[PDB]
Amino acid sequence: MATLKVIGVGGGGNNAVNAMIDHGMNNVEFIAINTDGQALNLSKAESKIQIGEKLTRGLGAGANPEIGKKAAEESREQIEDAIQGADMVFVTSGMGGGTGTGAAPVVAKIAKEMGALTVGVVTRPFSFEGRKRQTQAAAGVEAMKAAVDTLIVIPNDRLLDIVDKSTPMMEAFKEADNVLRQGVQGISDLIAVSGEVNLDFADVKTIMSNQGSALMGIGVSSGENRAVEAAKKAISSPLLETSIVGAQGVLMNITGGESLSLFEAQEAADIVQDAADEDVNMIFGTVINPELQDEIVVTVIATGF
Ligand SMILES: Nc1nc2c(ncn2[C@@H]2O[C@H](COP(=O)(O)OP(=O)(O)O)[C@@H](O)[C@H]2O)c(=O)[nH]1
């Protein structure tokens, strides 16, 4: 049974990890990382690492990624001790500030160099945060690409396509927390659900390793043609920056409220295989979530770009 750990890096990442904890992701261990001592005290993770004590004197990184980077490097041993034993590590962070932008790539490289399957799940800032955050965030994503095995980037501006028009700013960040939770949960569910192995870990690791940027989409449908419709939605999800056309590796999970037939799963898989336009190493699993009625959920991770 794989040891999964989820690490928040910086304020946005730790706020997302707090939402993961509240909501009850089970069978994973949570860690929070920050340069800002006071922000770090409000985090709900049982393992907390204040990085760059000497450098920052605990006062944060002031939106400077070079400071977040040197803080994580200063604290490398402590981060490694907190990671030791993980088979898989998620690094979650909002790109664009100092700590997550700078430290999250150091943290990822540390995990990867312990042999863990290292998955980044990160956001690009909303446009209201300004062109400067957006620029810093883009350098952050480029550094994260090299540091992880697989990177999932979610643009926060795309969240606005799937929330009510009346959504205030505070709720839009709560939505950002929820999407990071869903991306982490959805990838976690490829490994194990309800404490039971789903896809073979070694084969997941093979597909997700040393890939850099990858693509993740989740789609939902019901009634007639539900499997195919859910699959089409997954691969055209509003959160996707690219299409899956070309992908050399695909991991797929299909979730229903009763054990799904292989036939039906395979119809959804055929949509994803076709849309690829090239011949994939594709692996899929099926899971049961009792709370579902007639809805099927299709989760797709595509890599090899
Ligand atoms: N998910 C989430 N993202 C946030 C929140 N607050 C800010 N962000 C995003 O995270 C980015 C980095 O800010 P922050 O995490 O505060 O900076 P850092 O602590 O220096 O990395 C921001 O540009 C926002 O896009 C939040 O509460 N939740």
Swiss-Prot record:
Biological-process GO terms, alphabetical: division septum assembly; FtsZ-dependent cytokinesis; protein polymerization
Q: Which UniProt keywords apply?
A: Cell cycle, Cell division, Cytoplasm, GTP-binding, Nucleotide-binding, Septation
Which branch of life, at top level? Bacteria
GO annotation, cellular component aspect:
cell division site; cytoplasm
* Annotated localization: Cytoplasm
Q: Where does GTP bind?
A: G11, G12, G13, N14, N15, G98, T99, G100, E129, R133, D177
Q: Write out the GO MF terms.
A: GTP binding; GTPase activity
- Family classification: Belongs to the FtsZ family.
Query: What quaternary structure, including any partners, is listed in this protein's UniProt entry?
Result: Homodimer. Polymerizes to form a dynamic ring structure in a strictly GTP-dependent manner. Interacts directly with several other division proteins.
Function, as annotated = Essential cell division protein that forms a contractile ring structure (Z ring) at the future cell division site. The regulation of the ring assembly controls the timing and the location of cell division. One of the functions of the FtsZ ring is to recruit other cell division proteins to the septum to produce a new cell wall between the dividing cells. Binds GTP and shows GTPase activity.
Q: What is this protein called?
A: Cell division protein FtsZ
Can you name the source organism? Staphylococcus aureus (strain MRSA252)
